[PDB]
């Protein structure tokens, strides 16, 4: 509240910083490249003092860098700068390869969960009740590697055998 009756001013501070009095704070958010954003707004019902009564520390969850997350398409923006920073950070530990399990699952060629699952399911048949269910997956309103399933179904239906 800027210590006055004015509306608001955004204040950007580092982490180990002394925030102002709890009763005068309306909302706080944390944003940073990596851990997914967290934002809490304090209404009249609960105050910042009541929220922090258990402790003055708030935890944030870690966003997972999983191969299964990026099945076929990268939904992440993947900025060139943060990719370079991550590469430099990884090299610092490396200076201080197929060593991690993510490369192992990548080497096995089972990265795509849905594509592998439908490949097993289509192995033989093609019962009509199932076929409509598989066709429903191809005709999904929103999904990921939809084009992969469509062409896999085409390969099964009218491919070499």
């Amino acid at each position: 509240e800027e210590d006055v009756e004015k509306e608001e001013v955004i204040r950007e501070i580092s982490t180990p910083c002394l925030l102002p009095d709890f009763s005068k704070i309306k909302s706080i958010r944390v944003k940073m490249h990596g851990y997914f954003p967290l934002e809490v707004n304090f209404t009249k019902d609960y105050s910042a003092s009541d929220f922090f009564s258990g402790g003055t520390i708030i935890y944030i969850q870690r966003k997972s860098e999983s191969v299964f997350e990026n099945k076929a398409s990268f939904r992440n923006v993947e900025d060139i700068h943060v990719a370079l920073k991550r590469k430099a950070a990884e090299s610092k530990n490396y200076s201080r390869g197929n060593t991690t399990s993510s490369q192992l699952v990548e080497s096995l060629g089972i990265q795509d969960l849905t594509m592998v699952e439908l490949d097993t399911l289509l192995s033989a048949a093609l019962t009509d009740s199932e076929s409509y269910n598989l066709g429903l997956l191809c005709s999904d309103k929103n999904s990921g590697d939809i084009l992969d399933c469509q062409l896999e179904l085409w390969y099964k239906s009218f491919g070499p055998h």
Binding site: K71, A72, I80, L84, S95, S107, L151, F158
Partner: protein, 340 residues
């Protein structure tokens, strides 16, 4: 990107019936000659990278010189498109396991699009031909691990030998494919490998120069930054990318100096004094100091602490390291660790 297919037999039967009704002539045999020519399934009746005769071209002119004829003609195009769509993927699936290099997919693309110039079927305003091409590219990326690895190696080799134009074509191909190997990761790794090798080539064992990291960074920027920006497509004045590149350069400079610190302090001193002071500007963490000492002890004890070495030269080199590290470290805590 949903594409329909109505089986080869049905679409062929629809095609012969439509041509017979519209044309009222015996072009069906001659129509069958065209479909084989566009067909890469049969390698005897297709083009085989050979221009068609006058017969095929004349027919196309006939096919390509009221409302019912227009819609009957329109559904014909769609039916011809469906026939070719069946025909390309079946050929692609026949040779799916035979793909190992990018040059293979380009020649197959030329093989498929060879009839395209002689018979225009794809409308200009709809990039339909590109859509299935990206679809087939996407599947090849997401189904053939060996092709994916070969593309990684090919791009790494191409970026290593400064074949920038072919590398740009490869990056464009990957972006169009939109596969599980995004070009952003590849250019990051290619850039990281290139800067590491350039650093190894340039600032290896050269310690007389002052502010040489600036000299190295400027030389690399003038030699490769414009090409790299063209590859990525980002503006040339990307300030934060240049800052990160510089931060990686000094990190590489630190790593090289940590590796060579023994010859740096023992032999070149005091000629390498200047870069020692520059090194002092970079070291900031306790891990950096513990790595610098444990390496330096390891080599010094390896070489100098041999009793086969003369004791007078051993002491002379020893005090040379003492003054070198004292100038490097005003506190002298590392000297105490070395002395103990």
């Amino acid at each position: 990107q949903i594409t329909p297919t109505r089986d080869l037999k049905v679409i062929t039967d629809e095609l012969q019936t439509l041509s017979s009704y519209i044309f009222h002539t015996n072009i069906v045999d001659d129509l069958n000659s065209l479909l084989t020519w566009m067909s890469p399934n049969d390698a005897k009746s297709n083009h085989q990278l050979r221009p068609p005769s006058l017969r095929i071209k004349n027919i196309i002119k006939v096919l390509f010189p009221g409302n019912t004829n227009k819609e009957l003609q329109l559904q014909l195009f769609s039916t011809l498109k469906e026939f070719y769509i069946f025909q390309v993927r079946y050929h692609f699936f026949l040779h799916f396991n035979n793909i190992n290099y990018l040059k293979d997919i380009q020649r197959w693309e030329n093989y498929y699009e060879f009839p395209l110039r002689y018979v225009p079927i794809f409308d200009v305003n709809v990039n339909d031909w590109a859509l299935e091409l990206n679809s087939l590219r996407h599947y090849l990326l997401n189904r053939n691990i060996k092709f994916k690895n070969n593309l990684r190696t090919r791009l790494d080799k191409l970026i290593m030998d400064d074949d920038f134009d072919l590398a740009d074509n490869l990056i464009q191909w990957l972006k169009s494919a939109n596969g599980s190997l995004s070009s952003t990761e590849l250019i990051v790794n290619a850039l990281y490998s290139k800067i590491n090798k350039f650093c190894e080539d340039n600032m290896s064992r050269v310690w007389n120069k002052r502010f040489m990291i600036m000299e190295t960074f400027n030389k690399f920027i003038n030699q490769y930054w414009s090409q790299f920006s063209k590859l990525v497509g980002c503006p040339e004045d990307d300030h934060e990318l240049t800052t990160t590149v510089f931060n990686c350069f000094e990190s590489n400079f630190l790593r090289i100096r940590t590796n060579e610190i023994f010859d740096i302090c023992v032999l070149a001193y005091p000629d390498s004094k200047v870069t020692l002071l520059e090194l002092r500007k970079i070291m900031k963490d306790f891990k950096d100091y513990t790595n610098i000492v444990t390496t330096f002890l390891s080599d010094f004890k390896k070489y100098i602490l041999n009793p086969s070495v003369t004791t007078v030269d051993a002491l002379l080199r020893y005090v040379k390291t003492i003054k070198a590290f004292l100038v490097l470290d005003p506190t002298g805590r590392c000297l105490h660790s070395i002395t103990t």
